[PDB]
Design an enzyme around this catalytic site. Structure first.
Site, PDB file in Angstrom:
ATOM      1  CG  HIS B  52      -1.885  -1.151   1.497  1.00 59.76           C
ATOM      2  ND1 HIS B  52      -1.286  -2.265   2.002  1.00 59.76           N
ATOM      3  CD2 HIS B  52      -2.904  -1.282   1.074  1.00 59.76           C
ATOM      4  CE1 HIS B  52      -2.515  -3.274   1.884  1.00 59.76           C
ATOM      5  NE2 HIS B  52      -3.332  -2.721   1.511  1.00 59.76           N
ATOM      6  CG  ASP B  55       1.684  -1.084   3.517  1.00 61.00           C
ATOM      7  OD1 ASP B  55       1.208  -0.783   4.704  1.00 61.00           O
ATOM      8  OD2 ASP B  55       1.156  -1.680   2.729  1.00 61.00           O
ATOM      9  CG  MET B  86      -0.938  -6.158  -6.531  1.00 60.27           C
ATOM     10  SD  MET B  86      -0.888  -5.503  -4.896  1.00 60.27           S
ATOM     11  CE  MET B  86      -1.080  -7.148  -4.158  1.00 60.27           C
ATOM     12  CD  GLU B 179      -7.778  -8.117  -1.330  1.00 62.90           C
ATOM     13  OE1 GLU B 179      -7.021  -7.415  -2.044  1.00 62.90           O
ATOM     14  OE2 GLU B 179      -8.030  -8.916  -0.345  1.00 62.90           O
ATOM     15  CE  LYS B 181     -12.169  -9.054   5.552  1.00 61.13           C
ATOM     16  NZ  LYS B 181     -11.505  -8.234   6.512  1.00 61.13           N
ATOM     17  CD  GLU B 215      -7.449 -12.237   1.774  1.00 63.88           C
ATOM     18  OE1 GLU B 215      -7.546 -12.390   3.149  1.00 63.88           O
ATOM     19  OE2 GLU B 215      -6.789 -11.317   1.397  1.00 63.88           O
ATOM     20  CG  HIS B 218     -11.574 -11.644   1.644  1.00 65.37           C
ATOM     21  ND1 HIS B 218     -11.082 -10.631   1.154  1.00 65.37           N
ATOM     22  CD2 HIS B 218     -10.604 -11.535   2.897  1.00 65.37           C
ATOM     23  CE1 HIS B 218     -10.085  -9.808   1.963  1.00 65.37           C
ATOM     24  NE2 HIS B 218      -9.869 -10.517   2.921  1.00 65.37           N
ATOM     25  CG  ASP B 243      -4.491 -11.385  -1.937  1.00 64.53           C
ATOM     26  OD1 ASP B 243      -3.595 -10.799  -2.833  1.00 64.53           O
ATOM     27  OD2 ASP B 243      -5.172 -10.415  -1.281  1.00 64.53           O
ATOM     28  CG  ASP B 253      -9.688 -11.349   6.963  1.00 66.00           C
ATOM     29  OD1 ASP B 253      -9.374 -12.377   6.333  1.00 66.00           O
ATOM     30  OD2 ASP B 253      -8.986 -10.301   6.447  1.00 66.00           O
ATOM     31  CG  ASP B 255      -5.615 -11.870   6.836  1.00 65.19           C
ATOM     32  OD1 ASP B 255      -6.403 -12.659   5.829  1.00 65.19           O
ATOM     33  OD2 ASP B 255      -5.600 -10.573   6.814  1.00 65.19           O
ATOM     34  CG  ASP B 285      -3.672  -9.997   2.310  1.00 62.21           C
ATOM     35  OD1 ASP B 285      -2.784  -9.558   3.276  1.00 62.21           O
ATOM     36  OD2 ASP B 285      -4.654  -9.353   2.146  1.00 62.21           O
TER      37      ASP B 285
HETATM   38 MG    MG Z   1      -6.225  -9.565   0.449  1.00 60.40          MG
HETATM   39 MG    MG Z   2      -8.191 -11.232   4.628  1.00 55.19          MG
END
Ligand code: MG
Ligand code: MG
Ligand code: MG
Ligand code: MG
Ligand code: MG
Ligand code: MG
Ligand code: MG
Ligand code: MG
Lengths: 384, 384, 384, 384
Positions: B52, B55, B86, B179, B181, B215, B218, B243, B253, B255, B285
Site C-alpha cells: 500500500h 506502507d 502489484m 478484491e 470481502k 482472497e 474472504h 491472495d 478474517d 489471515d 496476504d
Molecule cells: Mg487480501
Molecule cells: Mg483477509
C-alpha cells in the site's frame, strides 16, 4: 392490513402444498389438490400461483392425463380470476437428476433435462407466464474432483443459450430468471449467489433475456445482506422476479413465512422494492412448518402477505417523515447521490481542494450521524 | 520443497510487517523497516513484494521524505533482485475514510480518495507493477439507511471509470483487480464476493481493464467454495491476481498462513491454478499470529511457500496417476467436457432418445463413483 | 419511553469510551474522561457503570496515581448517584497476555494474571460491586498443538478455585460470572458458549460462587439461539449478570446497540427476562460505530435503553392479551408445564393408554397451531 | 491401512442403509436388508453395528414379526462375530413426534416417547449394548412462543431421570449418552452443543449414568472446534461414545465420510483420542452421498476406516518425533501442565516475583514459537 389481488402476491403450488417430509421425518399432511390450493389462495387475497411442471402434472403422466390435469387447473383459474405469472421446471426430485440436469456429467441426462424444460416452457406460455425460473438445485458437487467447474459452466451456458434460441425461434414473450442458492441439497451449488448469477448472465449469447430471481433465505445462507444484493440486481436492471420468505441465519434452508427470520432485513427490503418501484410479483417461496395442520398452512400463508403490508406502511411512514428527511441530509445521503467528479478527470487533477489543500482532519472529525438515523428507522418499524 | 524466485511467490509489506494490533490488544512486535523485509524475504526464496502507498511512505510525508523513502526501497530491490508486481492504495486506515473512500457519503472525501489513488498508480508504474489492486474495505454500512446502495454503486462505477480514463490517457500498461470481502471492518461491504465483483466489472466503461483479486479467507467468510469461485473467474478470463492464506470457517478474517485453515480446499485450489496454467503471482496476504516473535514471522512466511509446493507436488501426482485417470472416466468427467447438443436445437428436439424413448430408470441407476475418486484424492494428498 | 435509574440500565466505561480503533483503522474519537462518562450517562437515565481495572487506572500507574484516579471517580459517583454493580479485569490488551492470562503456557504469566485480578477484586468490593466478571478473551489458540485443552482446563479451574478461596478468606460478598465467547481475538476461545461455561462451573470447588454473564452477540457468533441459552442458565440458577447488544449473524463481534441485529431475538429475550423476574443489571456491552462523533455516541447509548423499554412494553402486551393466552392453550403450552409422569415409573409402565392402546395417528394429526401464535407475537411486536 | 475388528470401528444400520432421500429428492438406492449390511461390514473389517429400534423392527410391527426380525439379526451377528455396542431410539421420523418426544407439548406424546424408549432399552441389553444414545432431534422450536424452554428442560430432566430409575431398577449395566446438535430438523434444538449437554447432565438425579455422544459435524454446524469440545468432555469424564464423520462448515448436516470436511480437525481429533486412550467404539454416523450406487456405499464406508488409520499413524509419528518434542518444550507445553500455584494462595500473594517485581516487558517479548510447531504438524500430516 388486508391483501387484494392488486398487491400482486403470488404463491407456488409446492409451498402451501408441502406435505412436511424433511430429511429426518415423514409427511405430516395429506397432499393438496392444486385446484383446492388455487381456490383457497384466491380467498385469502392472492393474485396468482406458480408451479413446477411436476407439481401440476405427475411425473410420467400420459399425454391424455396431462391434458386432463391442465384443463382442471385452467378451470380453477377461470373460476377464481387467479393468474400464473411464473413457472419453472423440476430438475431436482427424480433420481435421474442426482448429479444435476444442465451440468450432469452424463451427456444423455443433460439432453433430457433440456427437453423436459422446453416442454414446460410451451405450457408456461400457454398459461400466460411472463417469467420462467431456473433453480439449478442439483448443479454442483460434494467433492472436488467430481465436477470440473469450468466445463460445468460451459455446459450451463450451452443449456441457457439453447433455451434462448428456442424462445426466440418460437416468438415467445417470456424472460428467464436464474435463482441462486449457495448449498443444499448439493454440498456446494454452482452460481451460489446473486452476484455469481449476474456475472454468468453477461457471458450468455442473448443477455437481455436473462435476469435473476433471488430468494431472501438463500442469500442469508451465505451470511450476505439481502437488500444490498437486491440493490445490485436493480442497478444492473436484472431483477425480473423475487422470492420472499424468512431465514434465521446460516443453517439449512428454513423457508419460513415472510417477516419471520431477520425482521429488520425484511423492513429494508420492502423499503427498497417500494422506493425503486419494483412492479413484478411478490412471490412467497415458503414452507408452512410440519408442526401445522391445514388451518396452520393458511394462517402461515396469510401472515406472509400481512407482514409485507405492515412493513410497507412502516417504510412509507419512515420516508415520508420530515424528521427522517432531515436526518438523511445530516448523514449526507443527498451528497452520495451527486457525482464525484462531473467536472471531469483533468479538473479533478488540477483541483488543489481535492488533495493539496484538503483538510483531512476537519473532514475526519465530522460525525456521520448514522445511529440517530437508524434509531428513527427502528422507531418507525416498531410504531413508536 | 525449497522455493525459488521462479515460483513467483510474493508477499505484502504489511503481512510480515504486521505488528500484532488486533481489536482487543496492543502490538506485540516492533515495526519492520521495509528494506529489512525485502532482504529477509529475498533470502527465503520470494520473488517479490507488494505495498500500500501508506506502507512505504508514511501518511503526511513531505515530497522530499517521499523521495528518500522510495530511493531506499528501490536500492533494496536492486540489491536483492526482488520485483514489485502489484501495488494498492490504503483507503481504510485514516479516520477520514471512516465511511469509505470511493463511496463515502461526503463528496470531498470521494474526490480525495481518487487523488490519493492516482498518485500511487504513478508510483506503481514507476516501480514496475503490472496489477493495481483495490480493496474497498470501508465501502459499506452498519445500518440500512446509511447507504443507498444503488447510488453507492454509481459512485463506485464513477471512480473506477475515472481511473481507467487516467491510465489510458497516460498510456500506462497496468490493469486493475478488485478484491472482494463480505464484511469486516464494515458490517457489510459492497461487492462482497467474487461473483458480485465480476458482475460489477461488466458495467464499467472499459471492462477489459478490470479483473478480480480474490482472497481465500474472504470467500470462506461467506461459507463459499473458493476453488469454485476461482473457476468462475478463470472461465470469465478475469483472474488477474490472487491472495493466498488460510481461514477456519465463518468468523473474523484470520489471515492464517497458506495451507492452514481448510487444507483440502487448498489442495483443490492448487490443482486448479496449476491445471489452468495461471501465470500470475502467488501472493500471500497473511498475518503471522501476534503470539510470535520475529523468528516466528519468518517461519510462518516460509511455511506459506512450503505448503504451496507440497500441495503442487501432490496435485500433480494425483492427475498423473493412471488409476485416477481411469476413475475420472468412470465418473464421466470426460463427458462433462463434451457439448450437450453440438447437433443443434432442431436436432435435439427431433431426437426421441433425448426424451420420448429415454430410459430414466436406467440412467438413474448408474452410480457416479464419486466417493472412490475422492478417496483417491485423499490418498494422494496424504501421501498414502 | 424514558429510562429511570430504577430500570437498572448499566454501561461499561469502555463502551461509550471506545475510540474507534478496529483491525484496519485508527481511532476516530478522542478519549473520554471516565468522570465525563459518568456524568453524561447519569443524565441519560442510567443506573450505573462498570469497568475493567485498566479502564479506570492506566496500566503501570503508581500507587499515588491509582489513589487519585479512584478518588475522582468516587466523587463523580457521589455527585451523580451512579452505582458500580460489576467490575472485571483486563487480561487481554497488554502484550504479556498474548497467549492468555489464566491459561497462558508461561507459568509466570499465569501467576501475574491472578495477582492482577486479585488487586481489582479488592477495589471492586470497595466500590460496591456485587458481581465480578471474567472474560477469558485470550484463553485459546490459533493452532492445534499450541494448547493442550485438558491441561488448560486444569489451569483455568486452578485459577478460579484460588479466586474463590481468596474471596471466602476475605469475607467478601461478591460472586463471579464467566463470560463466554466462541472466538475473536483467538481463533478458538476456551469455554466458547454458555453451555460450556455452565458445565465447567460444576467442576469448581465452590460452584455456588460462580455463574455466567452471557452476551447476546457472542452466542449469535456461533449461530445459537440466545433466549434458549438464557433459559438454560436461568433453569440452572446461574444467570448472575447479562450483556446486551446486537449482532448481525455469524461474523466478527459487532457490539451494535441493543435492539439492532436480530430484533425478534431481542423481543424474545426481553419477554423471558421480565417473565422470569430477572433482577440484576441490564448491562450494555456495545460500541458506538466509529462513524459517529460524540453526539452519535450518546444517541447510540440512549437507543440501547429506549429499545429495551419498547420491547418490554410489547412483550407485556403480548402476554396480557386474552387472545394470546387462548392461543397458548391451543398450542398446549399449558401441558408442557405439567409433569409427564407424576404417577411414577411403575404406573407409566402399566398404563396401556401410553403405548399399547395409544392412537399415534390421532395424536399425529393434531396441529400445533404455532404459526397463528407466532403471527400474534409479530403483530404485538410491530404494534399492529 | 487395513482395519481389523480390534480397531473397534462401528457403523449404524441407517448409515450404509441410507436410501438417499433428501429434502428435495427421492431415494436413489433400494433398501438394504440389515442382515446384508452386517455381512458386508464384517467383510470390510468392522467390529460392530448400531441401530435405532425402527431400523431393525419396522414401526407398527407385531410382536411375532418383532421376534422374527430380531432372530434373523442375531443369526447374522453369530455368523460374522459382529457386536452391537450401542443402540438408540427413533423419536423423530414418525409424524407423532413432530413437536418432539421427551419435550413434546402434548403430554400423551411424551408418555408414549418414554414407553417406546424403554422397550428398546430392554432389547439393547439383550443384544449386549453398553451405551444407549439419545438424540433429541425433534426437541426444539421454529418460533419463540412455541416452547417455554425452562418447562421443556424440566420435561427433559423428568424423562432422563425416569430412564435412570428404570435401568437401576432392572439392574442393567448400561449408560446413557446424549447426542447434541444445534439445529436441523428443528430451527433450534435443545441442548445444542456438547457444553449444553454436559451442563444439563449435572442437574440429573444420577449424573453418573449419563455422558455425551458428540458428533464431528454437529459441533462444526455451530462453528465450534470439535477437538476442543472433546477435550472438555474427556476432562469431565463424560466421553462415553463418539460419532465420526465430516462436515464442510456451517450449513446443513452433510454427514460426509470421516476424513472429509475439515481434514486438520480430523487429525487433531485422532491425536487427542489416541493420546487420551479413549477405549470406546469409533462409530461412523455418515451418509454415502446419494450420487453413489452400492459399490460407492461400501467404498465410502471403507474410506471412513482407512482415513482414521492414516491419521492415527501420522499423529503417532508427530508425537514420537524428537524435533516435535523439542518444539513442544520451546512453546512451553510442559509449563502449561504444571500447577500455577501449588505453593498456595498466601504464598502467591507474598511472592513479589508474581507482581511487584515481575518484568512484563521481558515476558511479553518471548515468542511462543507456535507457527514452527504447527508447520511441523502439517509436515507430519502430509508425510513431508
Ligand atoms: Mg487480501
Ligand atoms: Mg483477509
Ligand atoms: Mg429456500
Ligand atoms: Mg425459491
Ligand atoms: Mg462482544
Ligand atoms: Mg461482553
Ligand atoms: Mg449429523
Ligand atoms: Mg450422530
Amino acid at each position: 392490513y388486508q391483501p387484494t389481488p392488486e398487491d400482486r402476491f403470488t404463491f407456488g403450488l409446492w409451498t402451501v402444498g408441502w406435505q412436511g417430509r424433511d430429511p429426518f421425518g415423514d409427511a405430516t399432511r395429506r397432499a393438496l389438490d392444486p385446484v383446492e390450493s388455487v381456490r383457497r389462495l384466491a380467498e385469502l387475497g392472492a393474485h396468482g400461483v406458480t408451479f413446477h411442471d411436476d407439481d401440476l402434472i405427475p411425473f410420467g403422466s400420459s399425454d391424455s392425463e396431462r391434458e386432463e390435469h391442465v384443463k382442471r387447473f385452467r378451470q380453477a383459474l377461470d373460476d377464481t380470476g387467479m393468474k400464473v405469472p411464473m413457472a419453472t421446471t423440476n430438475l431436482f426430485t427424480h433420481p435421474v437428476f442426482k448429479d444435476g440436469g444442465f451440468t450432469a456429467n452424463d451427456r444423455d441426462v443433460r439432453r433430457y433435462a433440456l427437453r423436459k424444460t422446453i416442454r414446460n416452457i410451451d405450457l408456461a406460455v400457454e398459461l400466460g407466464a411472463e417469467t420462467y425460473v431456473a433453480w439449478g438445485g442439483r448443479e454442483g458437487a460434494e467433492s472436488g474432483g467430481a465436477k470440473d467447474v469450468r466445463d460445468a459452466l460451459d455446459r450451463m451456458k450451452e443449456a441457457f443459450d439453447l433455451l434462448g434460441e428456442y424462445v426466440t425461434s418460437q416468438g415467445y414473450d417470456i424472460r428467464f430468471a436464474i435463482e441462486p442458492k449457495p448449498n443444499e441439497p448439493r454440498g456446494d451449488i454452482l452460481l451460489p449467489t446473486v452476484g455469481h448469477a449476474l456475472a454468468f448472465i453477461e457471458r450468455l449469447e442473448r443477455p437481455e433475456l436473462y435476469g435473476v430471481n433471488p430468494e431472501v433465505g438463500h442469500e442469508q445462507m451465505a451470511g450476505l445482506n439481502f437488500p444490498h444484493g437486491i440493490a445490485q440486481a436493480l442497478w444492473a436492471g436484472k431483477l425480473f422476479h423475487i422470492d420472499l420468505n424468512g431465514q434465521n441465519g446460516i443453517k439449512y434452508d428454513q423457508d419460513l413465512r415472510f417477516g419471520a427470520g431477520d425482521l429488520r432485513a425484511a423492513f429494508w427490503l420492502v423499503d427498497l422494492l417500494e422506493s425503486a418501484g419494483y412492479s413484478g410479483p411478490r412471490h412467497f417461496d415458503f414452507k408452512p412448518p410440519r408442526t401445522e395442520d391445514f388451518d396452520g398452512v393458511w394462517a402461515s400463508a396469510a401472515g406472509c402477505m400481512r407482514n409485507y403490508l405492515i412493513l410497507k406502511e412502516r417504510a412509507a411512514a419512515f420516508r415520508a417523515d420530515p424528521e427522517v428527511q432531515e436526518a438523511l441530509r445530516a448523514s449526507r445521503l443527498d451528497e452520495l447521490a451527486r457525482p464525484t467528479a462531473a467536472d471531469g478527470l483533468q479538473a479533478l487533477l488540477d483541483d488543489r481542494s481535492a488533495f493539496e489543500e484538503f483538510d483531512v482532519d476537519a473532514a475526519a472529525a465530522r460525525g456521520m450521524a448514522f445511529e440517530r438515523l437508524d434509531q428513527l428507522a427502528m422507531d418507525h418499524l416498531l410504531g413508536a
